[PDB]
Write a structure and sequence with these properties.
The complex is a heterotetramer, with two copies of chain A (394 residues) and two copies of chain B (253 residues).
Chain A: E1 7-8, E2 11-12, H1 21-35, H2 38-52, E3 58-60, E4 70-76, H3 86-99, E5 104-108, H4 113-125, E6 128-134, H5 135-140, H6 142-150, E7 154-158, H7 165-179, E8 183-186, H8 196-204, H9 206-219, E9 225-229, H10 234-240, E10 250-258, H11 269-272, E11 274-278, E12 281-285, H12 310-317, E13 321-327, H13 328-342, H14 350-363, E14 369-375, H15 383-392
Parallel strand pairs in A: 4-14, 5-6, 5-8, 6-7, 9-10, 9-14, 10-13
Antiparallel strand pairs in A: 1-2, 3-4, 11-12
Chain B: H1 2-12, E1 18-24, H2 30-42, E2 48-51, H3 62-73, H4 78-91, E3 97-101, H5 103-107, H6 111-121, E4 125-128, H7 137-145, E5 149-151, E6 153-154, H8 160-169, E7 174-176, H9 179-188, E8 194-196, H10 203-211, E9 216-219, H11 222-229, H12 234-250
Parallel strand pairs in B: 1-2, 1-9, 2-3, 3-4, 4-5, 6-7, 7-8, 8-9
The chains are: A alpha/beta (394), B alpha/beta (253).
The complex binds ligand PLS (2 copies) and sodium ion (2 copies).
Chain lengths: 394, 253, 394, 253
């Protein structure tokens, strides 16, 4: 059986071949043990604070909300070591691997951010790290691939199937199935077979825990809503977890709407896909009518996971969180807006969350509302992309 | 289910092992796949395990992965795979036919509906490669309601608790992946007869598996490599298949 | 006269055309006033903490010092908003411009980091910012130029003279001379005419002030030496200022030695140039025998200022600080070493400081020593450069 | 110094203003520069202000910047500029010759040595463009020890304190850059005679500066534009220079 529930309502589970069961059970026991071990908690805290740079700032954006009754804070996960929130849970998961006595790490990555996080954590903590990434994604992420390798990680391109994230995801599970005795599979989002949706939440929840502390300090009350992008669901479950029992605080996840939901070219399975079973879980997925799994499209490379974490599916089903979508052009507009009015260049993944907050403000400019957007990463990595588009349109 | 019981009872009376080849339906296209299958049965296959192509076979090695890509290059879909199974059954009424499925293709249009469609076309068993025993209840129950054997893999990292659940939940055959001991415990817990799987690619391993107490052997990818090597000559492909299968079958005698 | 001394011994001064005197005097009076104004200090602190992400971490590097008796901490200015220490003093200088009622900013930049800092501060604080940069440097810093412009800043290439930093420096002074009534010249290093060497120090000194607090907390005593790269001198004077009266703590500045001091192709005027008068100050400079000013060469683009701040020249003259040089290949080796053993990719400017600490450790591996290197910036911006070299050599 | 006193005393007896053109030594090369200078004096220049090329003329506009780049394209150095000044003085013993220098070129080999070299070649004054009165003491003292006039700019943003220091420290002439008032205060503080500078590029501004009480006018870049426009024809360049200078000089009468 398991120590913790593997389901969030009907979603989640452990849909993996029998041979990987013991690996999962082992990971879950290690995790439950770590969570009660003051020493583990103190070592995690020490690396977050002294290596990664926690707590991150909560920044109030006054120029963007001028002339409206919206006050907007941005949670600055873009200032963590590595430039995204991915760094938090890699540290936690690497420390768990050590705790289980493992000495190698296996990771999958799409845009390359989680790949770089896993290669930095493994360089710091002395683990030998190999990283799988779709050939098509290696091709368009050379800077990320080379950082991984400067950091000592082996990057393995995956040419099977679509040569994108889901294929890297399968290869990583394939490898772990035969090496879990000395290797840990460092999954990069709050999705996949239990226990990963739980572990990743619990290793990202300092996001929301810090935001609550910092918004009470600066405004003396909780936010009306917290808003985050949802690719697999980790940054967002990390911002929402410590608010789930605060019933007045709205939780809004934003999926990429790509060229527009009507086009079909999007990455919004929670609201526009269909439940299926893949990547070790039951959850909403981009899939054909006959059940083949398909790619998610977005202008942002990091919102490419073609399904969503089970805990999101569950919090949508019971109406505690609301999920919306934002298209490429709306995200690009929010990216430009933050650069020019606040001097922060956001990842285009996080620009989806900002664009939705901007729509909340602009659509109802005299509604008084206190909103926090999770700025999951910095957007230095996206400048070429934005340059080219801006160049293809003038 | 019944066809397995009939087959193993017949092999036990001839003191013979089963030899069960695996192939991907529709690889490298439908017509050539129908002919490969006919050849494996003419050559002596006692049962078949048949792959339905799925986009993300996270439980298959490279050989099979490439088999899927060839099948998808040919345009094959699960609805075509089920037309093929109906045809294959109308040709060979007794050979037990097993499917190797991914869970999403079973869950897609409703799990009970998938097993009702299996039953209508004449499938005898289904191994869902990414449903462990822990998650299998809706799969096994639907399988049983439509008289289809749910097959489970008994991994080498198996412990007692698992051997008991595989013995209680499985039917038709147990897919075995301390060889002599696992077998003895499965027998002790009255599990479905064990087929040794994985690695099986020469005659002497077939004889070895029968010697160890298994009911037979399944060759998980060797047939598939023969296809891959012979894509340029369909006639040489059939010839080597037949040759390979007659030799493995001979070893089980 | 002036309120504060414009000299550090014989170095420094106000060597500018008469027409810019009143601008300097004005800036100095504003500054002296700001420094006694609790409100100004509180607004600066608030932006450093909540926008820029201070205090930065002090990270202990245990894998790099293994098997030696050196303990090395790295001061993480690479985690400040913008990826370098330049952000600190731009905030202070922008707030001063506002205090003087100015609404435009003029800045110069070489590698582009100070350009990006000034364009982000001006986007946040509502100032209209134009930036001068040598044509040759615009050419090799397109990503930096485009970030400046996304942030709303006007980037003006400078084609006169060598088309590099010193020429941008002259153009910026030219412009200010005719616009100081509504524009502030936001100089990017601790050099130039008084009061800038003083202002920049005082707006970077939280570096050293935080390092002292954090090293006493973690080790209970002060460092044996603090080590920083020296291009114009700002990151280093910011790390050394709060230690100058702590006589046991060694201060070591590291200038780029380029291809090797013997080649002449370097950027180390403090120790290998000659005192001259240029850029509004008397200080050591790269110059020909007849007194024409020349460029500094380094593999790192940001150590290109061809002179050095006067306060460095003075602290070297009286022996309180020691200055050394590190070549391109030593810096590149330190860059690789930090990536692979600590998971931090440093700017190649800061890799000069690290390479000197690494030499202190390796040359005398049983000497017990506690060293802090100022990691002035992150080195994401240098990956292409390192890639190409590594590619030209295999 | 003496040559200025002699010149202004002579212009005052003819109730005339000085006209003083500026050019960069060696632009566009040495031989052509010697000839431009000869032409400006033949045409009526009462004194000369001569630029020495320096890498980073942070106090010059674009016209002059380009003049330096042409001079450096020709290979000109300060040691060549001083050979040129010696030659120019051996040709024209009374015309006061002013240099417009950057501080680094004066400080380079020692400030007193620079002014001793000026004195030996026959220079009368030096304006150091990036030394304000606040920093000028070593420059002015060395200048005075070698009988060279230190010239200061009196900026439009000048206040009383500055006007008094420029009047006390300057000699030869004051470089003026409430026009009528500045002049009156300079006279009141017995400053060196004022030359109006900047902007001076037509005859009517020369007459205007004399009318306002200045002792004359200096044309800071107009001569330089004439060079730049005529680079392709050295003979047309001399002709327009002569024409331009005779007209400006005529206006001062
Ligand atoms: C800045 C940033 N913000 C958000 C996300 C989305 O992931 P999440 O929903 O798990 O937060 C990503 C993911 N990026 C993943 C998937 O491509 C990776 O392997 O890098 C991100 O990089
Ligand atoms: C990371 C980093 N570290 C160090 C320095 C050197 O400047 P400093 O000596 O003033 O600290 C620079 C300077 N860069 C300047 C000069 O090119 C600029 O205009 O960006 C830097 O960018
Ligand atoms: Na998704
Ligand atoms: Na320098």
């Amino acid at each position: 059986t398991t120590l913790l529930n593997p389901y969030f309502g009907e979603f989640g589970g452990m849909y993996v071949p029998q041979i990987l069961m013991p690996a999962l059970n082992q990971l879950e026991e290690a995790f439950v043990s770590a969570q009660k071990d003051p020493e583990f908690q103190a070592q995690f805290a020490d690396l977050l604070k002294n290596y990664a740079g926690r707590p991150t700032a909560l920044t109030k954006c006054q120029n963007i909300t001028a002339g409206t009754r919206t006050t907007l804070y941005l949670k600055r996960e873009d200032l963590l070591h590595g430039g995204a929130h991915k760094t938090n849970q890699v540290l936690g998961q690497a420390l768990l691997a050590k705790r289980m006595g493992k000495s190698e790490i296996i990771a999958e990555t799409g845009a390359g951010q989680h790949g770089v996080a896993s290669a930095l954590a493994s360089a710091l903590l002395g683990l030998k790290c190999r990283i799988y990434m779709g050939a098509k994604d290696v091709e368009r992420q050379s800077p990320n691939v080379f950082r991984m390798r400067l950091m000592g990680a082996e990057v393995i391109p995956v040419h099977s199937g679509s040569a994108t994230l889901k294929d890297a995801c399968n290869e990583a599970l394939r490898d772990w199935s035969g090496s879990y005795e000395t290797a840990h599979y460092m999954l990069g989002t709050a999705a996949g077979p239990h226990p990963y949706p739980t572990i990743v939440r619990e290793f990202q929840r300092m996001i929301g825990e810090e935001t609550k502390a910092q918004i009470l300090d600066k405004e003396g009350r909780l936010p009306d809503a917290v808003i985050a992008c949802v690719g697999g669901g980790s940054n967002a479950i990390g911002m929402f977890a410590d608010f789930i029992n605060d019933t007045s605080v709205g939780l809004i996840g934003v999926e990429p709407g790509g060229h527009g939901i009507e086009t079909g070219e999007h990455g919004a399975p929670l609201k526009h896909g269909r439940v299926g079973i893949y990547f070790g879980m039951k959850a909403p997925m981009m899939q054909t009518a006959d059940g083949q799994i398909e790619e998610s499209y977005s202008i942002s490379a990091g919102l490419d996971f073609p399904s969503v974490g089970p805990q999101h599916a569950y919090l949508n089903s019971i109406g505690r969180a609301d999920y919306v979508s934002i298209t490429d052009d709306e995200a690009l507009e929010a990216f430009k807006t933050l650069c020019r009015h606040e001097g922060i260049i956001p990842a285009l993944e996080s620009s989806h969350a900002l664009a939705h907050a901007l729509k909340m403000m602009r659509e109802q400019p005299e509604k008084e509302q206190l909103l926090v957007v999770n700025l999951s990463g910095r957007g230095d990595k996206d400048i070429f992309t934005v340059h080219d588009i801006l160049k293809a349109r003038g | 289910m019944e066809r397995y019981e009939n087959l193993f009872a017949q092999l036990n009376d001839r003191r013979e092992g089963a030899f069960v080849p695996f192939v991907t339906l529709g690889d490298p296209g439908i017509e050539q796949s129908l002919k490969i299958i006919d050849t494996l049965i003419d050559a002596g296959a006692d049962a078949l395990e048949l792959g339905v192509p799925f986009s993300d076979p996270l439980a298959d090695g490279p050989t099979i992965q490439n088999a899927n890509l060839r099948a998808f290059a040919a345009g094959v879909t699960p609805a075509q795979c089920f037309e093929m199974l109906a045809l294959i059954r109308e040709k060979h009424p007794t050979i037990p036919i097993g499917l190797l499925m991914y869970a999403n293709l079973v869950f897609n249009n409703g799990i009970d509906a998938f097993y009702a469609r299996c039953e209508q076309v004449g499938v005898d068993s289904v191994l869902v490669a990414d449903v462990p025993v822990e998650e299998s209840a809706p799969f096994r129950q639907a399988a049983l309601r439509h008289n289809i054997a749910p097959i489970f893999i008994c991994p080498p990292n198996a412990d007692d608790d698992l051997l008991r659940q595989v013995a209680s939940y499985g039917r038709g055959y147990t897919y075995l992946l301390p060889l002599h001991h696992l077998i003895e415990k499965l027998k002790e817990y009255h599990a479905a007869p064990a087929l040794q799987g994985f690695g099986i690619s020469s005659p002497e391993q077939v004889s070895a598996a029968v010697r160890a107490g298994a009911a037979g052997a399944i060759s998980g990818s060797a047939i598939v490599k023969i296809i891959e090597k012979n894509l340029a000559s369909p006639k040489q492909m059939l010839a080597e298949l037949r040759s390979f299968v007659s030799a493995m079958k001979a070893a089980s005698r």
